[PDB]
Amino acid sequence: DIQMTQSPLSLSASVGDRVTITCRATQSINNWLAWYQQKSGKAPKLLIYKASRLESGVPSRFSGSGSGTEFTLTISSLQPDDFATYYCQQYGSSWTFGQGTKVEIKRTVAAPSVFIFPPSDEQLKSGTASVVCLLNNFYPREAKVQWKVDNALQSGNSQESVTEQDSKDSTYSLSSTLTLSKADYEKHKVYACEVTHQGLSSPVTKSFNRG
Amino acid sequence: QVQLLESGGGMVQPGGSLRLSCTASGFSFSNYGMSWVRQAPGKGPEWVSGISGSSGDTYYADSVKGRFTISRDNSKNTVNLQMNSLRAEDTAVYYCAKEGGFCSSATCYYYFDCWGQGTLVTVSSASTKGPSVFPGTAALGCLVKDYFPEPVTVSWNSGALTSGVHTFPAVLQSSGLYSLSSVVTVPSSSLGTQTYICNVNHKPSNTKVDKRVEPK
Numbered sequence: 001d002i003q004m005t006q007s008p009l010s011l012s013a014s015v016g017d018r019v020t021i022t023c024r025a026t027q028s029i030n031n032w033l034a035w036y037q038q039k040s041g042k043a044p045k046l047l048i049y050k051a052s053r054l055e056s057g058v059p060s061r062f063s064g065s066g067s068g069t070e071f072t073l074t075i076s077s078l079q080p081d082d083f084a085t086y087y088c089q090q091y092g093s094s095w096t097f098g099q100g101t102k103v104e105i106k107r108t109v110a111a112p113s114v115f116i117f118p119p120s121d122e123q124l125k126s127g128t129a130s131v132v133c134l135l136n137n138f139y140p141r142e143a144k145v146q147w148k149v150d151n152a153l154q155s156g157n158s159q160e161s162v163t164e165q166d167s168k169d170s171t172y173s174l175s176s177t178l179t180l181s182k183a184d185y186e187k188h189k190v191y192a193c194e195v196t197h198q199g200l201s202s203p204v205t206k207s208f209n210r211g
Numbered sequence: 212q213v214q215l216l217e218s219g220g221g222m223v224q225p226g227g228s229l230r231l232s233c234t235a236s237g238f239s240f241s242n243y244g245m246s247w248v249r250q251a252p253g254k255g256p257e258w259v260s261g262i263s264g265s266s267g268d269t270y271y272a273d274s275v276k277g278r279f280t281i282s283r284d285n286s287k288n289t290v291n292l293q294m295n296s297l298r299a300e301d302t303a304v305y306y307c308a309k310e311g312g313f314c315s316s317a318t319c320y321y322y323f324d325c326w327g328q329g330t331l332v333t334v335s336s337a338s339t340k341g342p343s344v345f346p347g348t349a350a351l352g353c354l355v356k357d358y359f360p361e362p363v364t365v366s367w368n369s370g371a372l373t374s375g376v377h378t379f380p381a382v383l384q385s386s387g388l389y390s391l392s393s394v395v396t397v398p399s400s401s402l403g404t405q406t407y408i409c410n411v412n413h414k415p416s417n418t419k420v421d422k423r424v425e426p427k
Contacts, residue, residue, distance in 0.1 A: 001273075028236040032324035033309075043326040044256070045267075049311055055324070087256060090319040094270065095246070113350075113396075120354070122422070130356060134394055136377070161380045161391070175379040175392050210339035 002026045004090055004098040012140065013078055013102035021073040021086055021101045028068050029092030035064060035073050037086045040164060044087065048073070066092040078103070083165075090111075096135045104141065107170035112138035112201030116192070116206045119185065129185035134194035137171035140198060148192040154178065213237035213325050215307050218289075222337055224385035230296040233307035233327055235288055242267055244310040244318065245283060245290045247302040249332075259305070260292055263318035263415035274300070297334040304329050307405050309333065335361065344411045346419040351424055352394035353409035365393040366410045 001165035006020040023033065038044040048056040048064040051071060061076045075082060083105050088098040112135035119129040132147055132156070142164065147154035160176040192207040233245070246261040260281040261270040269281050280293040290307060308323035342358035360423040365378055370393055372395075381391040398403060407424045 001419045009242075030242070036323075043303070043306070043329060044323075045323065045326075046311065049324075074216075089322060091322055093320070095213045095261065095320060097256045097258070115350050117352075117354075123343070123354070125288075125341070128356075129273065130354065132354065132392060134350065136350065136396065159382045159384075160381050161381065163377060170332045173377040173379070173394075174271050177390060179384075 002029065002090055002093050002096055004088055004096050005175075006098035006101045008086060008101060009099070010102040010104060010141075010165065012106045014106040015078050015080055017078045017106075019078050019103065021088075023066075023073070023088035023098050025069050025071075025090050027089045027093065031067050031090035032090060033064075033066070033071050034089045034091065035062075036089065037082075037084050038087065038188075047086075058093045062175045080108045083152045088209045105165045105167075105170045107139055110137060110139040111200050112136055112143070112169050112174070112195065112197055114193070114204050114206050115133075116208060118191070118208060124182060124185075129180050129182050131180070131185075131191055131193075133176050133178075133195070135176075135195060135197070136173040137166070137169070137173060138197060138199055139171055141172050142198065143174060144196045144198070145174070146194050147176070147178050150188050151161050151192060153194075156171055213309070214251045214340035215325060215327035217305065217307055217327045217330035218298045220305065220332045224336055225298055225334055225413075226296055228293070229297060229332060229352075231292040231294065231305060231330060231332070233290045233292075234292065235307075235309065238309070240283075240288045241285045242313070242322065244314065246308045246323065247281060247290075247292050247325065248306045248308050248309070248326075248394050250306075251300070251303040257299075260423075262263035262290065264310075264314075270286065281355055282399055290339065294332065297332070301323060301332065302334045303332060304327075305332055307329075317378075338387060339416070341410075341416045341418045342411055342413045344409065344422040346422045346424050346427075347399060348396065349399045350394055350396040351407060352392055353411065353422060353424070354390075354392050356390040357388040357409055358390075359388055360415055361389060363391070364410075364414075367395060367407055369410060372407070 003026045005024045018135045035048040036044040065072045086101045115134040117132040158178045162174045194205045196203045216234045244263045247259045250256040254381045259272045262281045283290040300338035307327045309325040310321040323397045342355045345354040375394045376395040381389040
């Protein structure tokens with residue numbers, strides 16, 4: 001019944017940086033704490049066990065410190081292979097995982113390119129209308145997408161999905177899908193998605209009339 | 212050479228039951244204790260079940276206590292997890308882990324040093340559905356909507372032109388079907404010059420649908 005809380009949730013860093021991740025337990029777990037590295041599509045790999053012991057084959061740049069309720073993971077000099085998500089795990093009473101710490105690749109700020117797509121004729125003929133707004137190759141990951149139907153901001157009726165940082169240029173890409181019935185789509189004329197982002201000086205509005 | 216191999220995952224309806232397996236080799240199965248770790252897509256990993264090497268003491272997670280049943284057959288070097296009354300929240304990727312270091316007692320807590328490849332367990336009222344493909348500078352793409360199950364393979368011009376393509380991860384809707392998109396950026400002056408055809412294949416349904424992207 002011990003809960004593990006990692007800090008920071010996410011941190012963007014550059015190769016060569018010193019990086020420290022904190023992991024806290026509810027109850028005191030002495031020194032029964034492990035750390036793992038996981039890459040997208042791979043099994044997790046043990047880095048450190050018993051709070052301060054390095055797992056065989058893990059690079060010397062990984063170390064760990066702490067006891068009781070407060071623990072740290074430090075990477076002395078971050079390397080390209082090290083961009084990943086890190087989890088701690090206690091085994092002092094049962095087995096519980098932290099929420100994860102994402103190490104994002106640092107790059108310069110990049111504004112998204114914004115596009116809006118009307119539902120296709122092939123889709124409309126079937127009774128459903130999906131309107132898509134694309135934010136292409138941006139940084140940082142934090143971004144706001146807002147849907148406006150006849151210039152009325154939408155909430156609750158959209159879903160979004162975002163890619164991991166591109167391995168060539170370290171940008172993100174993001175999909176947002178608005179789903180309405182064909183009927184409701186045909187009752188209105190002007191569909192607009194307005195995008196605010198840290199790479200954009202002011203919100204960008206992109207807009208069409210259905211015709 | 213220590214390795215763990217899972218098996219048994221698949222697709223079940225809510226309320227049904229499923230059974231997993233995990234064949235271990237390379238170490239002394241009798242000595243080390245085992246465990247089952249799962250991770251739901253989009254959340255952090257959680258411990259599910261656990262068993263000792265020889266004593267037979269078993270432990271389960273709070274969210275699955277009473278439903279799952281973990282067992283092992285040291286004579287045949289196998290650990291099995293029985294998953295009864297599966298629910299939507301039980302849909303995750305299930306691993307079998309191995310105790311790290313050693314244990315001086317009979318059953319004890321530990322860290323996981325070796326993992327298996329990972330097996331997939333899906334729980335949904337599976338309405339099997341095929342994928343629906345929809346057709347200065349502007350970007351185009353193809354929208355695949357309402358398909359089951361995963362995955363779908365999208366390629367532009369049979370994998371030739373691939374630069375600037377970004378295929379998005381699918382999302383699950385309250386109806387049970389998936390939806391994703393694959394975009395690509397080109398100068399708008401290449402509408403009639405450059406023809407883009409997305410090749411969406413759905414191996415479970417054996418259905419490929421090509422929708423040519425022509426200037427509208």
